Structure formats: C-alpha cells, structure tokens
Amino acid sequence: RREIRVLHLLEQIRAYCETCWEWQEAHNPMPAPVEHQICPAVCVLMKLSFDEEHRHAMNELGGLQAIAELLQVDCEMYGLTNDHYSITLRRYAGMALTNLTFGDVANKATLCSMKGCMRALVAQLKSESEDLQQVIASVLRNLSWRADVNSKKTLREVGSVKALMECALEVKKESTLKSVLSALWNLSAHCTENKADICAVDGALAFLVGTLTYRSQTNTLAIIESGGGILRNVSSLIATNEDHRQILRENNCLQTLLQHLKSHSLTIVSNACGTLWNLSARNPKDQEALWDMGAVSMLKNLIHSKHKMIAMGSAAALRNLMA
C-alpha cells in the first residue's frame, strides 16, 4: 500500500527528529543522520513526491510538516556544513517541500507558519552548495507565488529578500540563478519594503540591468524574463530615486528597454512596458531621452495588445511622454 509505505518513511524521520530535539534540550552525545539511514528515507520520500497519489498520502499524514522539521533540525545541528551527506539530505528534503508546496494553498501556509524552519531555509542561501541554493530558492519561489498576507509578512520578516538578492550577486551557475531570480520576482511584488531592500543591496540595480542583455547560451529567455520582472517591480521605487535612476542611465537601461519592446516574448515586452510606465512618469530627463530614442513609435503599436499589462503599460508610458 502507498499509505503504509509513506507512513513508514514519515515515522522514520519523526523518530529521528525526536532524538535530535532531545539532544537539543541538553543546554549525552550528538545523534548522527548516517547512523539512522535518514538520507535514504528522505531520498525515497523525495522521489515519491513527484507522484500525485503519493503526495496525497503525504498530505493525509502531515508529511510536509515532518520533512520540514527534519530540514530545520539538520540545519540547526550542523550549520553551513560542506559535508556531502547533510547537504544531500537537505537537497532531497527541499525538493520534496517544493513538490508538496506547488499549487497547494494549505501546504504553503503551513510551511510559512513554521518560523524556525523558514529561518533555516533562508540561512541555507549562504550554503556553498549551489545545488542546495537552487533547491531552497525553489521552495521560496513556491511559497511566494500567490501567498496569503501572513505568509507574505513571514517571508519578509525572516529576511528572504536580502538573502536572495545577495545570493543572486554571488551564484556561479545559470541554473541556480534562474530559481534565485524566480523567487525574487515573486517576492519583489509583495510590498514596498521588499523593493527597498532589493534596491539597498550594493550593486543590485546594475546587476538587474545586466540581466536585460544576459547572454543565455543555454538558448532560453529565463534570466531576461526574471531579472526584468524584478526590475519592473522595483522600478516603481526607482522612479522616485534620482541616484537609482542614474545607475540605470549609466547602464543604458532605457535603450535596452526599448529593444525589449521588439521581443517575441510577451513576458519580456510586458516587463519592459511596466518599467517604462514608471520611468517615463514625472521625470523630464528620462522622458526626453525616451523621446529622442524614438520610444513613441515603438510604444504606439502595443496599445492594442491582447495582453492587458502590455496594452495599459505601453498606453500609460505613451501618455507620460505626450503630457
């Protein structure tokens, strides 16, 4: 039976966590995960989380909570270890949390309500393991997509935004950057504080502008779309900040945004329209540059787009130039 199999595995990691918490109570030695064949149990649980029916059995047996607790406790016990076994364990746990959070309202809220785990998740963004960083950003991505108000507050309070922005300036692999930026894309929409935090990170704006012309030799637009989506979101705050505007000017942001108007990707066009909406508002200097770069002609043919953001964004930008 699926259910007995899932129960077995869940009981295994609960009993291990119980051991770990008992050790923690002590201000009698430290338990070891290898000793309890914990990584294999998580591994199977991870594999099974790709299957809908097994996911369902997990949800009936509080699987999410159990896997989250394990991740939390291993993070608290060993910190930012480079040990292969504990990193593996954390990866598999995170992959399973990702699978169980996707599209699941109740699971997302449950995970965010687990404060200690949320703190552990965020701390893992400073792990030297890019694979682990990728997985954690995947969890944060799901938790931040269409979240309820309390979850949005929690995600902000545990320092997700600054940790993700710093992580983005640092990561070496395109695959890691992709999920880091995806999560930032979601989070940057949530509140104005998140936007300020992104803009506050030294070099963040230059970096974001750089993603607009990212040389994706993996033949995708993922980085352009994500980086530019973050930029669109924080652009509303950039608009009110002369120094930040200047950083954009120094990296030819406006010029590039105009070329994104010609992109075949509706996501890209949509992002650029939103960004131009904000940057073309109440700034003679940038309005003037936009006029001189031929923005009007590029924007007028987008006002009838079927995509609401492109239509409104381009129309609003056009009106900002015409006023």
Binding site: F50, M95, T98, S138, W145, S182, W185, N186, E225
Partner: peptide, 10 residues
C-alpha cells in the same frame, strides 16, 4: 506589476 511563477522541478 505582478509575480513570476511556481513549479515542481527539483
């Protein structure tokens, strides 16, 4: 002015 996406992948 909106979010990106969610997913299953690893």
């Amino acid at each position: 002015s909106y979010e990106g996406y969610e997913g299953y992948y690893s």
